[PDB]
From a paper:
Instead, fly‐specific [name] appears to combine the roles of both HJURP and the Mis18 complex: pre‐nucleosomal [name]‐A recognition and its targeting to the centromere for deposition, respectively (Phansalkar et al, 2012). In this study, we present the structural basis for the recognition of [name]‐A/H4 and [name]‐C by [name].
Crystallisation trials carried out with [name]‐C1264–1411 alone and in complex with [name] produced diffraction quality crystals which diffracted X‐rays to about 1.8 and 2.3 Å, respectively. Consequently, just one molecule was present in the asymmetric unit. The β strands assemble into two β sheets: a six‐stranded (β1‐β2‐β3‐β10‐β5‐β8) and a four‐stranded (β4‐β9‐β6‐β7). Dimerisation of [name]‐C cupin domain is mediated by a back‐to‐back arrangement of six‐stranded β‐sheets. In this arrangement, the loop connecting the N‐terminal α helix (α1) to β1 crosses over to its dimeric counterpart resulting in a “roof”‐like positioning of α‐helices on top of the β barrels. The surface area buried at the dimerisation interface is 1,706 Å2 which is about 50% of the total solvent accessible surface area. The interactions stabilising the dimerisation are predominantly hydrophobic involving residues L1283, W1286, L1287, L1312, L1314, Y1325, Y1335, M1407 and L1357. Structural comparison of dm and budding yeast [name]‐C cupin domains showed that although these domains share only weak similarity at the amino acid sequence level (21%), the overall fold conferring the β barrel structure is conserved.
Residue numbers in the entry:
A (entry chain A), B (entry chain A): 1274 to 1411
Amino acid sequence: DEQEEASTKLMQWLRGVGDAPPSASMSDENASVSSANELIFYQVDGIDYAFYNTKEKAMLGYMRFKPYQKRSMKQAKVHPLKLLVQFGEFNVETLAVGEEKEVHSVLRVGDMIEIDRGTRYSIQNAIDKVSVLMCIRS
Amino acid sequence: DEQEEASTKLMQWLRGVGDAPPSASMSDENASVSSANELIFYQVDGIDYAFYNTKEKAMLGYMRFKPYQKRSMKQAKVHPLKLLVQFGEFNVETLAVGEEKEVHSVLRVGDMIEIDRGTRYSIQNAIDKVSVLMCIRS
């Protein structure tokens, strides 16, 4: 249940509900390791982002959405990405290169969507609670 | 609490404790979407793997470890990877190209380690419960 407690503490922090998870080991000093305690949320144009400190920056992180919050349209101009739902529910609208018709998808926890290079995409929190997604860039 | 229930059901399935999460939307039919219900665990050399069905296969998935289970040494020969702890605790041993001294790291939930191209690495479940990690390939 210790590990259930650790998991719950991490999720509550990601959702903005709880305090930062405790430290545990000196492994957070290792070059290749980015611990959860490294994460710090910063707000950009209304959305809270927190990224691990990887060798190539901004390649793995979380987006935290206020209830029903909208992220404006962006384009995967350089890096294809994957969006993986960590908590809650999201509506994602995509328009791939060459197509002229948008696609709307609904994503619940554990669902993933792949955004190809060139695809324009918008994200909206579908529920009246904070939702969290993981952003994985290629 | 509906979304707390969905999150708990997904984690219990990943840990091998519960049944598959329910369906929800027709978005699982969308080309770019890989729903959690797509996941199916298969055992290879003692370890349970489940991968999303992405355009380039085997690029995002989970490894489920029995108590104290060891994954033998592998090498990131082609793809650098990131390992992100989803539940439990792992000891990871790495030997990067050019170095002659191994590095041992301990990872708890939400911690990530980056395995560079050429690095040899071994993984052991550090606890007497099932632990789960996410494997992210570049």
